[PDB]
Structures are given as structure tokens and as C-alpha cells.
């Protein structure tokens, strides 16, 4: 009847790994001393949990450690506008009552959840499907009316909206299907037979050279003489390609009192 | 180092891994929170020995206790009582909140931070579940009519009818005829 | 998916719900907290969540995963990287199936057709 | 012009507006229109600001 | 489909290539109220 141990216990083989995040000499020396006497030290605290004993988290000196919250620009002012920028400081300064309040969930992520419908409403749905596959849809009127009556209205609204969402997602997935299965002009008339016997590694740096000059030793033996000659050849080709240039279009956002178009920004200011 | 993390898994088969780290025999008899009691209880035991320091000057022990209080206040936070709570970062394990996993409202309060909408209201489903009245004991010595009446009451057996919601007591609703004297605020 | 290095913040804020999180750009200041020497190109620091990924590698090369990687400059990078890809995965999904929730979408507050005005 | 083009989100309560479930039972089946995504809001002449 | 019926109207694949030019719209957390003192 031995207590159960978690996977982390087999990595360290002890319950007393004195992990302190503060990288000061006083702290790491004391931890090494405390890490060695943890077997016979009464002032020992566990950091690896077990079935029989809970544990503490990572230590920060005498206090406890927690990562800096992910940057969040949302804040709430009290006295004056602070213009809080989470990217201007490494560690987030504490929130003073008269200065700022930060957003909730210092350590939180975005997820999607769903409420659990009432148990009696679920049993009426089970009875409808069961009577459906057995007796057919046309003979499930009594089971359908029990749903509309026993299930509270807030649940019927959820059921009504689930159908509209999945109908929306169904279209969003089929539009991606259409864009994905579209045959571009550079693949017209090409099939699996015209495919090359290559794998992912054949498009990597070892087999496919990147578009940079110093990725390998290709251009390491080039001299200034060869460069001046190459500049002359590229300029020769430009004697035939520069003949064409796109025409300047009108500025759709010329009027400042008009909602501008979110047009692609220029590469450079 | 990534391969050193998987050393105990290469020597094992999949069935051995599950029986080892996943199918741990249930045993809910241990005092898991002894780790926190020993650590935090040591402050009180340490104060017993520290309050007896042979330091002669009274104001020199004022400095020692000021340093000792700083060690505690790193965990307790607020020195005043009935003001706040301490802050302890603990390890995450499968036995966190193990005895309250059956309750749904406890999960929503701990896990979910809901985003308020323009129609600023609590979700209707959450409001509807909240109206299903909880069970409130009849025993009441705070209302003097019951303090007298319940002395002559006969406790009869409530034979189980096969449900989990038998209202054999009063209900925790302000509009219940046996709870209207209770102030719900 | 974002097919650029820069994105408009307002495009990832909600229009009919309270805004409690933003989608900030990479925190370039965390790159100066690495005490060791490393090579980083400026062409990779703007793309979302990749800077925190490269930093985690640099920290996992200089140090390991035991008793030396456990320093504040290296753990915050690992936490940021893990958190950045989770938030971006959810925002990307929310943009794919719930584009009407965000500012800039023409479906957050649809403009009616002229046939609906009765003129 | 900026404050003329400064609107608030969500408009007014749709529940205070005529329902489509009621028009059906009244004898008129409404036709569903799409969103007009090609119009750009602009401010009027200065005299009307 | 797999012993399940999902009633949906006729899908129009032409809606995929719908030209929707993006328009500018900025949200200002911190702005103006209706009345001031």
C-alpha cells in the first residue's frame, strides 16, 4: 500500500528539489546546502507532489515565483491617464490603487465552453432519437412535444442557435474547400503523374538552396571584377523589361471626411 | 535533456506506463495538506523559540521581530485581520480540488472568466440553475417561534422514494413559507 | 492565420463585448534580458510568437532543462511562447467562424440594403 | 467630421423591434436581405456639422 | 448522412469569391460619454 508517485518524481528521484528562481549567490548556495540535508532536515518543504502529500511551487527567495503575466494593454485609470504600455517594461509594475487597475486573469487563456443542458431535457432528447431510429420520425410527435414543454425556453434557444452556428461553420468549411480544391493557372492539366518523387527534406536547406547569398559557399569566390560584369548583364536585361510600368491609380481615400479603405500599407513610409 | 525526460518511459511498455502513472490505486485517506500545515505552522513554533532570545536591549529584539514579520508577510501579505488572504503558490497535481470535482459551480467560479456583453446580464442558464432552491435545515433556534414549536415536533422517518431531491427540510428561497424570516442579501 | 508581420489591433478587438485582452506585438525588450551571447536577426522578431520560440531555443542551448534553465529570463520566454500560440490559435479560430464579433467586420453591425428603407 | 463618424457599438435593443416570428403569424413572410459591405460612411458638408 | 439528416438550404458556392473590401474602423478604449458635469 505504498503512496503513488507522479512522473516528475522519477526524473528527480526526490521530493525535495530546492528550486529557487532568484539567481543571487546567497540563494543558490543556501539551496545547495538545503538540497543536500532535505532527508534529515525538519525545515524541509516538498516541491514534487504525491498521492499522500501535496507540494509547493517554485520559490523566489523567501517568496514564491510566478511568471510575468502575458502582456495585456487593457487597463483602467483612476486619477489620470497613464498610457500603460506592457511592452515598455520587462516586469509588470504593481497596481497602485490611485494609478491603474489591470485586466482580470493575470494567467488566463481564451477558450470556448458550453453549458450542460438540464438532465430532464436530455432524457426527452434521448427518447426522441430512440423512438426515431426505431419507429421513424413521423411517429415521434409525442416525444417532440415533451421536449418543447419540459425543456426550459433558455435551452430551446441554445438548441435553436446551435443549428445556426453549425450551419455557419458548415459554409465556412465548404468555402475553404472550394478555394483549396481550385486549380490555378500554373497547375492546369497537371495530375499525380506529373508530380516529382520528392519529400519534405528535398525542399530544405541541404537540398534546396535558400534565396540568400551567404547560405552556403556558392558566392564566396566572387571578385569585384565579376561583379562589375554582372551589373552590366542585369542592366542589359532591363533594357527590355523597363519598357513597361503600371499606371498610377486614383487615391480612393483622397477625401478625409470619408471612411477610408483598409488598403495594403506601403512597405516603407 | 529532452531525451533525459523520457528515460523512465523507454524501459516500460504502454500497459506498464498506464498502470504506473495513470492507474494509481485510489486512496483518499492521506493528509495531503500536512505539507502546508508543517511549513506555515513553523512560523508559530519558530516564534516560541525566537521570542526567548537573550538579547538584552528591547529595541534590538524589535529589529529581529521586524525581520521575522517580513519573512511571514511575504506569504500572508496583509498584516491586519479580517482584511485579506495569504498567497501561496502550490504544485499542480491530479488531486487538486479532488473532493469537489462533483460540483459544477465550483469549476465555473475557478476556471471561467466570462466576458460581459452589451446586454449586461448573467447568462440566463446560470440564472435558471440558480433558482433551483437549495435545501435548508428546519432546525432553528434563532427564531423564537421555532425554538418553542420544534420542542413539541415529532421526528418521523422520511422513507426514501428513490430520488436525490426529497424536500424533507425547508428550502433556501426567500419566498418559502418556512424561510421568509431569513434575510437573503 | 495572419499572413504578415503586422496586424491592426482593432481588428482583433470585440465590438459588442467587453475588451479584456489585446493581441500585442512581440515583446522585444525581453530579448535584452538574456545574459549570454546570441545571434538574432531582425527579420524574425515581428512575426507572431516566433521570437519567444527562438529565445526558448537559445536558452535551452546555453542552459539545459534542469537547475539552469530555471531563471526568470528563460521561463518567461517559454511561458510567453506557450501562451502566445494558444491565444493566437483561439483568436484565429474566432476570426474564422466568428468574424462578426470583431471590429472592422461588416457583419458586426450590418448596413442595410436600400430596399429595406422603404423609399 | 470625426464625431459625426463616431458611433457606439451594438445600436439599440433588437427585442424592442418588430419580430419576424410575429409577422409570419400576421400574414407577411419577411424577405431576408444581405449586408451592404460596399458603402463607406462619410461626413456631410460643413454646414450640417 | 450517416443515419442523420441535417436540413439546410441550397448552398451557393458563388458566395466564396465575394469581393468585400476592408474598411477602416478603430475602437477607442477611453473616449467620450453622453453628459459631463
Amino acid at each position: 500500500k505504498a503512496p503513488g508517485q507522479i512522473y516528475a518524481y522519477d526524473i528527480h528521484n526526490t521530493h525535495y528539489p530546492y528550486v529557487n528562481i532568484k539567481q543571487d549567490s546567497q540563494t543558490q548556495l543556501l539551496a545547495s546546502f538545503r538540497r543536500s540535508i532535505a532527508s534529515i532536515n525538519p525545515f524541509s518543504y516538498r516541491q514534487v507532489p504525491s498521492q499522500d502529500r501535496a507540494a509547493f511551487g517554485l520559490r523566489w527567495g523567501n517568496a514564491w515565483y510566478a511568471p510575468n503575466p502575458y502582456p495585456n494593454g487593457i487597463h483602467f485609470d483612476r486619477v489620470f491617464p497613464t498610457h500603460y504600455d506592457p511592452l515598455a517594461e520587462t516586469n509588470r509594475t504593481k497596481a497602485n490603487l490611485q494609478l491603474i487597475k489591470y485586466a482580470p486573469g493575470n494567467y488566463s487563456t481564451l477558450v470556448v465552453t458550453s453549458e450542460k443542458l438540464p438532465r430532464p431535457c436530455i432524457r426527452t432528447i434521448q427518447n426522441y432519437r430512440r423512438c426515431q431510429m426505431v419507429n421513424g420520425t413521423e411517429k415521434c410527435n409525442s416525444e417532440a412535444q415533451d421536449i418543447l414543454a419540459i425543456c426550459p425556453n433558455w435551452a430551446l434557444d441554445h438548441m435553436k442557435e446551435k443549428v445556426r452556428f453549425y450551419t455557419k461553420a458548415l459554409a465556412i468549411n465548404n468555402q475553404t474547400y472550394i478555394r483549396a480544391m481550385q486549380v490555378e493557372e500554373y497547375n492546369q492539366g497537371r495530375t499525380v503523374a506529373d508530380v516529382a518523387p520528392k519529400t519534405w527534406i528535398h525542399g530544405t536547406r541541404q537540398h534546396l538552396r535558400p534565396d540568400t547569398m551567404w547560405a552556403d559557399d556558392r558566392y564566396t569566390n566572387i571578385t569585384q571584377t565579376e561583379i562589375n560584369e554582372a551589373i552590366k548583364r542585369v542592366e542589359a536585361r532591363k533594357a527590355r523589361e523597363h519598357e513597361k510600368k503600371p499606371v498610377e491609380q486614383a487615391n480612393v481615400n483622397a477625401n478625409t471626411g470619408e471612411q477610408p479603405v483598409r488598403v495594403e500599407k506601403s512597405l516603407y513610409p | 535533456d529532452f531525451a533525459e525526460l523520457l528515460r523512465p518511459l523507454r524501459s516500460l511498455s504502454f500497459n506498464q506506463v498506464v498502470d504506473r502513472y495513470v492507474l494509481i490505486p485510489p486512496n483518499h485517506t492521506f493528509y495531503r495538506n500536512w505539507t502546508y500545515e508543517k511549513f506555515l505552522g513553523g512560523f508559530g513554533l519558530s516564534y516560541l523559540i525566537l521570542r526567548e532570545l537573550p538579547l538584552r536591549n528591547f529595541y534590538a529584539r524589535v529589529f529581529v521581530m521586524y525581520a521575522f514579520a517580513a519573512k511571514v508577510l511575504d506569504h500572508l501579505g496583509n498584516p491586519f485581520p479580517f482584511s485579506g488572504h495569504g498567497q501561496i503558490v502550490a504544485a499542480a497535481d491530479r488531486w487538486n480540488h479532488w473532493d469537489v470535482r462533483c460540483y459544477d459551480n465550483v469549476m465555473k467560479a475557478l476556471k471561467y472568466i466570462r466576458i460581459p456583453t452589451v446586454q449586461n446580464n448573467i447568462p440566463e442558464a446560470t440564472r435558471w440553475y440558480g433558482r433551483q432552491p437549495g435545501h435548508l435545515l428546519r432546525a432553528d433556534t434563532y427564531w423564537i417561534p421555532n425554538l418553542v414549536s420544534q420542542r413539541f415536533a415529532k421526528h418521523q422517518p422520511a422513507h426514501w422514494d428513490g430520488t436525490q431531491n426529497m424536500p424533507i427540510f425547508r428550502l433556501a428561497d426567500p419566498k418559502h413559507k418556512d424561510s421568509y424570516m431569513v434575510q437573503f442579501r | 492565420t495572419i499572413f504578415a508581420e503586422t496586424w491592426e489591433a482593432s481588428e482583433y478587438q470585440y465590438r459588442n463585448k467587453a475588451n479584456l485582452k489585446t493581441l500585442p506585438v512581440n515583446h522585444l525588450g525581453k530579448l535584452a534580458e538574456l545574459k549570454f551571447d546570441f545571434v538574432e536577426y531582425k527579420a524574425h522578431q515581428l512575426i507572431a510568437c516566433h521570437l519567444y520560440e527562438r529565445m526558448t531555443i537559445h536558452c535551452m542551448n546555453q542552459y539545459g532543462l534542469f537547475k539552469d534553465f530555471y531563471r526568470p529570463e528563460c521561463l518567461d520566454a517559454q511561458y510567453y511562447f506557450k501562451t502566445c500560440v494558444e491565444l493566437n490559435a483561439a483568436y484565429g479560430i474566432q476570426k474564422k467562424f466568428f468574424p462578426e464579433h470583431f471590429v472592422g467586420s461588416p457583419y458586426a453591425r450590418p448596413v442595410p440594403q436600400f430596399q429595406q428603407l422603404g423609399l | 467630421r470625426m464625431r459625426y463618424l463616431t458611433e457606439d457599438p451594438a445600436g439599440d435593443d433588437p427585442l424592442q423591434k418588430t419580430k419576424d416570428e410575429h409577422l409570419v403569424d400576421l400574414g407577411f413572410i419577411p424577405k431576408v436581405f444581405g449586408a451592404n459591405v460596399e458603402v463607406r460612411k462619410r461626413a456631410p458638408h460643413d454646414k450640417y456639422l | 448522412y450517416e443515419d442523420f439528416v441535417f436540413t439546410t438550404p441550397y448552398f451557393q458556392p458563388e458566395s466564396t469569391f465575394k469581393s468585400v473590401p476592408k474598411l477602416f474602423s478603430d475602437i477607442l478604449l477611453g473616449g467620450v460619454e453622453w453628459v459631463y458635469t
Partner: peptide
């Protein structure tokens, strides 16, 4: 939802000054 929330359709530039917030 935040009381001081406004949706603007034209670009604006805010001042990065201490103790003040304006266009």
C-alpha cells in the same frame, strides 16, 4: 461593456504625453 467606448471611422493620432490623453 466599457462606458467610455467609441468606434471611430476616420484615422486619429493620440498624444503620447504624461497626465494627458487627447487627439
Amino acid at each position: 461593456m466599457q462606458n467610455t467606448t467609441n468606434i471611430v471611422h476616420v484615422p486619429v493620432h493620440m498624444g503620447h504625453t504624461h497626465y494627458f490623453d487627447y487627439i
